[PDB]
Every structure is written in structure tokens, then in C-alpha cells.
Paper text:
We recently discovered that [name], a substrate receptor of Cullin 2-RING ligase ([name]), recognizes C-degrons containing a C-terminal proline. By solving several cryo-EM structures of CRL2FEM1B bound to different C-degrons, we elucidate the dimeric assembly of the complex. Furthermore, we reveal distinct dimerization states of unmodified and neddylated CRL2FEM1B to uncover the NEDD8-mediated activation mechanism of CRL2FEM1B. Our research also indicates that, [name] utilizes a bipartite mechanism to recognize both the C-terminal proline and an upstream aromatic residue within the substrate.
Due to the limited resolution of C-degron peptides observed in all solved cryo-EM structures, we performed local refinement for the N8CRL2FEM1B dimerS1 to obtain a 3.55 Å resolution structure of the [name]-[name] subcomplex. For convenience, the peptide is numbered from the C-terminus, with the last Pro being Pro-1, the penultimate Ser being Ser-2, etc. Most residues of [name] are visible in the structure except for the five central residues (−12RELNG−8), probably due to their intrinsic flexibility. Pro-1 is accommodated by the same [name] pocket that has been reported to recognize the arginine at C-end. The main chain carbonyl group of Pro-1 is hydrogen bonded to the side chains of Ser122 and Arg126 of [name], and its side chain forms hydrophobic interactions with Tyr84, Trp93, and Phe130. Specifically, His-21 is positioned in a hydrophobic pocket composed of Val391, Phe501, and His502. Additionally, the imidazole ring and main chain nitrogen group of His-21 form hydrogen bonds with the side chains of Gln394 and Asp356, respectively.
Numbering used by the authors:
A (entry chain D): 1 to 627
B (entry chain G): -22 to -16, -7 to -1
The structure:
């Protein structure tokens, strides 16, 4: 009788009071429990009829279910599908998340669990704070709700309310004996989220309640996070707390000026110089000498600038915008170090701007510094190499001689990142195995784009030797995609994706130059994927044998003359002349095919099923296994 | 262009 359960779920989800009354009419107690407790799936979520009735805000349906039928408010289901697959959520949690005060009042009063604990210890009060409705939070808290109960990561009810722009619920919680000194898994308190979001009222009400400013796990006080999030008005109120001393104020002002200098949304120059000069003034106005700062050595990425340690050194860079960007990057680096999460993103954005306004050399310097910083922190540099491929392709399309040491460094960090990605794939079992494999394939494609760009540049002998050394290292690393394609199958396959940006205009696979460069670096020419197709079974399938015949000819003579087997048979029992589908490719392969007694004897051995195990030399067992 | 391409939820569960 699952049909009645499905119709009842539909009637409860869509608020059909009369239809649900007609459906549950003429039913027995066991039937009533079966229909009103059954778990139904209607896209992404497991939910009972009452869970989906309260989650859709159908007050009449929920009140009808609890008045006559002895339904229980402790059922288990799933509610959301925006990165939030949470089990064990009762009807209170669904009602609070959907923000329906009219159902939660009719649900609690009928014997409900106000402080239910789901799988990730999320109280229904947490959902009501997430929505921000004061009426639901107040009703729950008045009905014996715990405020200090948090999830496994210690994200209390107050912190999620402080993260969002809800003011009334935050003020009410701080008025209801809440704890303003919660410590999350990363050390973040309530002030960090409220400051980074940009809510002045939440921060003011917290510092009114003795918020007890403490540095988070990643060496960042709330002032530093507020300044890093480019929130000026948030930072300029914690200085009145009288416990901030002076160095914290100075570093907050300097970080705020830095973040204003190099940001996308709120990009300021008058405000940047105003705050930087305020910080330097408060540094150098003490009178008993100064309040000096330790400064990193001149970083080659930002020219040769040792930031600014002189009153006539900031007054003389008010009128320059590149100098302000460089100084902001330098102070943000010396404040945040290099291992912080959000220290490299302004560098990446400034590099993107410099690429946009045709400053390709400074773009390259800044973006190599960004990749070096991210490699020190071991973050996900899979998009960064793609952006390098796009920038270099734009360089070649503009007939600009790209510097070869830069390409060597990019390739070295590409092979290091590919090794890191292989380690990550070997580590991440199943939680993000598809994401890891997608990142790995993207990294291999970016390395191939860099190789093709390298073939498009006339480098010297030493530079070409270094590029060959990096390609040699990655080839001997032997990467393999999810389809078993090595770096040679993709260099000859016409189906390898090319990024929609300028990389289409330069890196056009298949390339005879890329394949020749790989084969000069000891590429496994006889490499076999999991399907069976070799490096030669793939190229002969090329659908353009006349348009770029040279790019075909010089790629089907480079394979065969190096180490390829012309007659080797894949797992589908297909000679490369059989898997050709092109007269030109078939003839161009047949002209390179030298018949030999070994291939004929191996084919005659394999055809009639002769037991060739341990009766032939070990190097001929794989030979017979080919044909 | 280049700038027009650059455009934690586990800890932010409701």
C-alpha cells in the first residue's frame, strides 16, 4: 500500500488539508502509523509526511496531524540539498530552518523536542538562528532550549547568528546568558565571523558584552580578520575598547590599507592612502624615537620596493597607483606571512589586472610569487596553472617573446603539483575521489598546454634543455588519467579539451611538435590505457587528415620511428589499420609498416591458442600478448 | 577578460 503513502506525502507537502483528510479517512491504527511514519523520497531528500508538512509551512496540515492522530514529533529525515545533506532532522529543525513560526508554535505545544540533537549536533535553535527569525528563537529558548549546545566543530547558536546579518536574534541571545567566548575548531570566536561578514551592530553588541578578544587558531585577531575582509567601519570601533594596546591597532590599520589597495569589489586609492598614512603617522608620531616595523627584503615580484619607512616615502607615492598596489601587497604579506589561506588571492587578482592592462611581465612575476606562496601552504593550485596557460597563450597570440625561465618555473611547479595531486588521489579514498580525479586530469591538461606553449617559443639551448629535463621528470613519473591515457595519448588525441580562453588559439591538439618533444624525453610510446588503445591506435583515428596533414604526418612518423609497434593489438582485437576509419591515415601508417617474422609468428601463435607461458623468453611473453 | 573569470560550508551548517 505504498500508493497511499505516496499520495499522503504529496498531500502533506503541498498543504492539501481536504485531500489528506480524505486519504487518511477509513484507516486503522497500524495503517495510520504506516502512512504517517513512512519515509518518502521526492528528490534528493528522505522525509516523512509530517517533516515535509512542517518544512513547507503548512500549519493546517501539521495541526491536523497532531490533533486527532497520535503522531510523534521525533521522526528522522533529510531537509536540504545545497551542499547540506543532514540526517536526523526532526520536524522542529525543518520548521526552524524554513522559518515558519506558525508551525513551530503548534509543534512544540503538542509534546515536542525543543533541544533535539541531529547527526551533526545541530539544535533546532541553530536553524532558527540561521534563518534569523526572532520569534522562533525566542519561543524555542523560552521553551527550555540549550544555547551552549553546538555541533562537533563548536559552532554555537550565537556564532551562526553572528555570521549572518541578523541583529535582533544576536542581541536577544546576548541578552539571554549566551557565551561570547566560543572557540571553534579553527580557533574562530564569534567576533571573527561577525567582523569578516561586515555587520557593525553584531560586533558592537558583542564588545558591549565583554567579547574577550582572543587570537584565533591561524594567528589572526578579530581586528586582523575585519581589516582583511576590507571592512573599514568594523575595524574603527574596536580601537575604543581600551585593551587593544598600540601594536594591534597599527597592524589592523596597515592590514586594512593593504586590503583596500588590492581588492576587487571595494578597490579604493584615496581610502587606501588615507589609512596607510594614518597607520604610518601613528607609528612615527610617538616622539620617543619611533615605533619601527620589521620589513621583508625587497621581493622581486613587486619590483625592488622595500615598502616605505620614511615620511617622504609615502607622501611621494600618493600619486602612483602601481606603487600603492605593490606596497599593499608587501604589507599584507609581511602581516599575514606566507602560510595564511587568503594571502595569495590579492596577488592573483593584481596579476589578473596587470595582465588585463597589458603588463604581462609584472603579471608573470606576481603570479609566480602567488604559486610559490600557495606551494608553501600546499593549497589547490589547479586553476592557477590553467590561468598561466591562458596568459602564455595570450602572449603567443600577441607575438610576445615569453621568458623561458618563467616557463621553466611554471613547469617545475606544475610537475610538483601533479605529484601532489597523485598523492592526494592515493590518499582521498572515496569522499572526493571524483573531485580529485577531475583535478588530476585538469592538471595534466594544463601541463600539456604549457608544453605546447613551450614548443611555440624559441628558447636558447640551456632553456630548452631545462624544459626537456622537467618534461623528462614528469614523463618518468608516468601520469595516467581516469581513462588510462598517458601524456602521449592526450598529445595525439583530438578529443582532449582545450580551455575556452585564449588557449584555443595556440594549444591545438594533436601536435606533432608536442609529441616529438615528449618522445625526446623518453615517453612510453607503447603505453596502453585501460581500454587497450596505444599511442598509435588513437592518432590514426584523426578526422582531419588533409587540413593539417603535416601535423598528422610528423606525428605518425615520429611515433613509429621512435619505438611504436605498428601491428600491436588492443584489448578489442583490432590492428591499428582496423581502428583507422581514414584512408589517408591508413596509408600513412602502412608506409611505415615493416613486416617482420616476429609479428607473423606472434599472430600465428595467438590465433590458434598455443600455450606460451614460460616456454618463451620473458620479453616475448608481453610481445605475444600485444598481438 | 582575465579579471572577469575569478568570480567552508561544512562549518556553516544550519
Amino acid at each position: 500500500m505504498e500508493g497511499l503513502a505516496g499520495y499522503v506525502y504529496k498531500a502533506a507537502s503541498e498543504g492539501k488539508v481536504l485531500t489528506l483528510a480524505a486519504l487518511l479517512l477509513n484507516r486503522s491504527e497500524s495503517d495510520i502509523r504506516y502512512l504517517l511514519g513512512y519515509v518518502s523520497q521526492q528528490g534528493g531528500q528522505r522525509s516523512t509526511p509530517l517533516i515535509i508538512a512542517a518544512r513547507n509551512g503548512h500549519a493546517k496540515v501539521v495541526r491536523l496531524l497532531l490533533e486527532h492522530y497520535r503522531v510523534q514529533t521525533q521522526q528522522t529525515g533529510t531537509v536540504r540539498f545545497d551542499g547540506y545533506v543532514i540526517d536526523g532532522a526532526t520536524a522542529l529543525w525543518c520548521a526552524a530552518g524554513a522559518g515558519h513560526f506558525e508551525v513551530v508554535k503548534l509543534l512544540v505545544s503538542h509534546g515536542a523536542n525543543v533541544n533535539h540533537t541531529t547527526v551533526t549536533n545541530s539544535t533546532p535553535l541553530r536553524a532558527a538562528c540561521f534563518d534569523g527569525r526572532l520569534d522562533i528563537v525566542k519561543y524555542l529558548v523560552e521553551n527550555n532550549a540549550n544555547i551552549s549546545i553546538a555541533n562537533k566543530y563548536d559552532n554555537t547558536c550565537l556564532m551562526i547568528a553572528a555570521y549572518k546579518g541578523h541583529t535582533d536574534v544576536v542581541r536577544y541571545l546576548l541578552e539571554q546568558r549566551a557565551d561570547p567566548n566560543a572557540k571553534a575548531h579553527c580557533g574562530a570566536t564569534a567576533l571573527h565571523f561577525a567582523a569578516e561578514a561586515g555587520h557593525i551592530d553584531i560586533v558592537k553588541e558583542l564588545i558591549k558584552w565583554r567579547a574577550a578578544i582572543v587570537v584565533n587558531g591561524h594567528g589572526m585577531t578579530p581586528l586582523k580578520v575585519a581589516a582583511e575582509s576590507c571592512k573599514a567601519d568594523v575595524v574603527e570601533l574596536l580601537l575604543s575598547h581600551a585593551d587593544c594596546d598600540r601594536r594591534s591597532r597599527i597592524e589592523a590599520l596597515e592590514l586594512l590599507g593593504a586590503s583596500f589597495a588590492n581588492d576587487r569589489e571595494n578597490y579604493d586609492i584615496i581610502k587606501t592612502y588615507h589609512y596607510l598614512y594614518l597607520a604610518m603617522l601613528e607609528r612615527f608620531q610617538d616622539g620617543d624615537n619611533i615605533l619601527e616595523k620589521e620589513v621583508l627584503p625587497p621581493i622581486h615580484a613587486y619590483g625592488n620596493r622595500t615598502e616605505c619607512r620614511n615620511p617622504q616615502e609615502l607622501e611621494s607615492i600618493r600619486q602612483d597607483r602601481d606603487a600603492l598596489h605593490m606596497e599593499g601587497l608587501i604589507v599584507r604579506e609581511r602581516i599575514l606571512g606566507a602560510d595564511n589561506i587568503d594571502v595569495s588571492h590579492p596577488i592573483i587578482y593584481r596579476g589578473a589586472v596587470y595582465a588585463d592592462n597589458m603588463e604581462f611581465e609584472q603579471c608573470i612575476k606576481l603570479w609566480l610569487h602567488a604559486l610559490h606562496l600557495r606551494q608553501k601552504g600546499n593549497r589547490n593550485t589547479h586553476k592557477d596553472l590553467l590561468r598561466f596557460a591562458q596568459v602564455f597563450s595570450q602572449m603567443i597570440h600577441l607575438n610576445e617573446t615569453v621568458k623561458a625561465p618563467d616557463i621553466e618555473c611554471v613547469l617545475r611547479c606544475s610537475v610538483l603539483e601533479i605529484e601532489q595531486s597523485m598523492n592526494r588521489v592515493k590518499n582521498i579514498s572515496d569522499a572526493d575521489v571524483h573531485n580529485a580525479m577531475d583535478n588530476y586530469e585538469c592538471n595534466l591538461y594544463t601541463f600539456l598546454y604549457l608544453v605546447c606553449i613551450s614548443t611555440k617559443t624559441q628558447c636558447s639551448e640551456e632553456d630548452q634543455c631545462k624544459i626537456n629535463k622537467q618534461i623528462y621528470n614528469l614523463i618518468h613519473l608516468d601520469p595516467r588519467t581516469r581513462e588510462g591515457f598517458t601524456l602521449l595519448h592526450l598529445a595525439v588525441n583530438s578529443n582532449t579539451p582545450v580551455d575556452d580562453f585564449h588557449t584555443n588559439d595556440v594549444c591545438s591538439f594533436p601536435n606533432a611538435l608536442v609529441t616529438k618533444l615528449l618522445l625526446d624525453c623518453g615517453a612510453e610510446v607503447n603505453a596502453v590505457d585501460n581500454e587497450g588503445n596505444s599511442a598509435l591506435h588513437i592518432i590514426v583515428q584523426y578526422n582531419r587528415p588533409i587540413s593539417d596533414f603535416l601535423t598528422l604526418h610528423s606525428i605518425i612518423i615520429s611515433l613509429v620511428e621512435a619505438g611504436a609497434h605498428t601491428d600491436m593489438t588492443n584489448k578489442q582485437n583490432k590492428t591499428p589499420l582496423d581502428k583507422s576509419t581514414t584512408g589517408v591515415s591508413e596509408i600513412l601508417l602502412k608506409t611505415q609498416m615493416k613486416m617482420s617474422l616476429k609479428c607473423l609468428a606472434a599472430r600465428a601463435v595467438r590465433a590458434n591458442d598455443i600455450n606460451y607461458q614460460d616456454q618463451i623468453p620473458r620479453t616475448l611473453e608481453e610481445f605475444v600478448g600485444f598481438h | 577578460k582575465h579579471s572577469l573569470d575569478l568570480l567552508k560550508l561544512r562549518h556553516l551548517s544550519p
